[PDB]
Design an enzyme around this catalytic site. Sequence first.
Site, PDB file in Angstrom:
ATOM      1  N   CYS A  87       0.867  -1.160   0.000  1.00 42.44           N
ATOM      2  CA  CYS A  87       0.000   0.000   0.000  1.00 42.44           C
ATOM      3  C   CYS A  87       0.921   1.232   0.000  1.00 42.44           C
ATOM      4  CB  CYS A  87      -0.882  -0.057   1.248  1.00 42.44           C
ATOM      5  SG  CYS A  87      -2.147   1.218   1.421  1.00 42.44           S
ATOM      6  N   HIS A 129      -8.816  -4.099  -3.178  1.00 42.05           N
ATOM      7  CA  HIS A 129      -7.914  -3.368  -2.315  1.00 42.05           C
ATOM      8  C   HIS A 129      -8.363  -1.900  -2.248  1.00 42.05           C
ATOM      9  CE1 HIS A 129      -3.729  -2.547  -0.637  1.00 42.05           C
ATOM     10  NE2 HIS A 129      -4.130  -1.342  -1.011  1.00 42.05           N
ATOM     11  N   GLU A 130      -8.575  -1.296  -3.411  1.00 48.65           N
ATOM     12  CA  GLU A 130      -8.976   0.104  -3.462  1.00 48.65           C
ATOM     13  C   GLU A 130     -10.365   0.346  -2.921  1.00 48.65           C
ATOM     14  OE1 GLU A 130      -6.372   2.041  -3.799  1.00 48.65           O
ATOM     15  OE2 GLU A 130      -5.336   0.146  -4.367  1.00 48.65           O
ATOM     16  N   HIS A 170     -10.391   0.692   0.686  1.00 43.59           N
ATOM     17  CA  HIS A 170     -10.020   2.021   1.173  1.00 43.59           C
ATOM     18  C   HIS A 170     -11.191   2.923   1.421  1.00 43.59           C
ATOM     19  CE1 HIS A 170      -5.753   2.039   1.602  1.00 43.59           C
ATOM     20  NE2 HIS A 170      -5.573   1.558   0.382  1.00 43.59           N
TER      21      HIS A 170
END
Length: 183
Positions: free
Chosen positions: A111, A154-155, A158
């Site tokens: 990250c 993953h994004e 966020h």
Amino acid sequence: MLTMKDIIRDGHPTLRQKAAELELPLTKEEKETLIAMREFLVNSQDEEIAKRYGLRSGVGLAAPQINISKRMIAVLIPDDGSGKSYDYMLVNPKIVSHSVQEAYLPTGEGCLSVDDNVAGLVHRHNRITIKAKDIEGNDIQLRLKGYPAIVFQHEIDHLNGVMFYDHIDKNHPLQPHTDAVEV
Ligand SMILES: O=C(O)C[C@@H](Cc1ccccc1)C(=O)SCC(=O)c1ccccc1
Ligand code: NI
């Protein structure tokens, strides 16, 4: 252009917020920041420009990571073998459906907002379907398996204030889950 001094770092509380849904159409400012986000990834993937501005390499970036608590992301995953590339800027992305079968990167994840490497597997859904908006407010439906699936998860993570390392099993961090595909 964005650089690393724009990316906020682990411990910063914006990273633990839940980012707000955008209204549509987007503002000029919102478009600029999403375009730039993309330009950062592109830039971080050029060896010369990364050398010159000290960019760490990226394939994904969520607006929270530049301290903007809004639900937009960028993904730029260059060709790499198969003839599939992934150049997407998404507003309000949402995983509407996914496989039971999990997948993982054998070397774990990284990250931009995190400075220690962190070992440990992060199990994710091997296939996903995302509904989102593009930068002009048009509709997108993505079907993704493998590495792209992981990247986009993953994004998305966020935007809910979730960091990849939250998914690491405390006591057996390198233990694959049974029947999970290694990517
Ligand atoms: O920091 C981020 O949110 C972006 C990040 C996302 C990521 C998703 C899944 C696994 C690992 C990391 C990165 O883009 S890290 C850079 C990277 O993996 C890479 C870039 C260029 C060539 C090879 C690898
Ligand atoms: Ni990250």
